[PDB]
Amino acid sequence: QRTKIVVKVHMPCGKSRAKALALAASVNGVDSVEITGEDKDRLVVVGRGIDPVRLVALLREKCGLAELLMVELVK
Amino acid sequence: IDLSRERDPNFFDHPGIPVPECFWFMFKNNVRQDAGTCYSSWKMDMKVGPNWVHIKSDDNCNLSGDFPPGWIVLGKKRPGF
């Protein structure tokens, strides 16, 4: 039930950027968090058990903007 | 659109998990919007313009899904895959 989730998160700084990481990585079931993207505005979250609606909603309130980009169950 | 011409996405393959076989590329009116990796012979959900779209991959990374007008997501197998 491992899945990869990519979220677009408002994080201009490196410091709201570390805010987002540690927050995504505090979520139950997460295995890794990486930031990617030409604009480094993507959180990649991997784990099993994760509610994507909960991931985004949390990042939303705590960073202001978050939209789901992709959810891919690990083959 | 020419996938053989497109630069590789920004990817990081996590050491524990199986290495996805495909690059996908997402275009709005033939302009590259995003790119990434996904599994072949599989399935993902993706934000494509305004819509959350369910996408199937076949074993040669052909992506199929019901994309909104002006948008498309295209695949190919990564090098050596």
TrEMBL record, chain B:
Ranges where the AVR-Pik-like HMA interaction domain occurs: 19-79
Disulfide topology: 22-61
Keywords tagged on the record: Signal
Domain of life: Eukaryota
Name of the protein in its database record: AVR-Pik protein
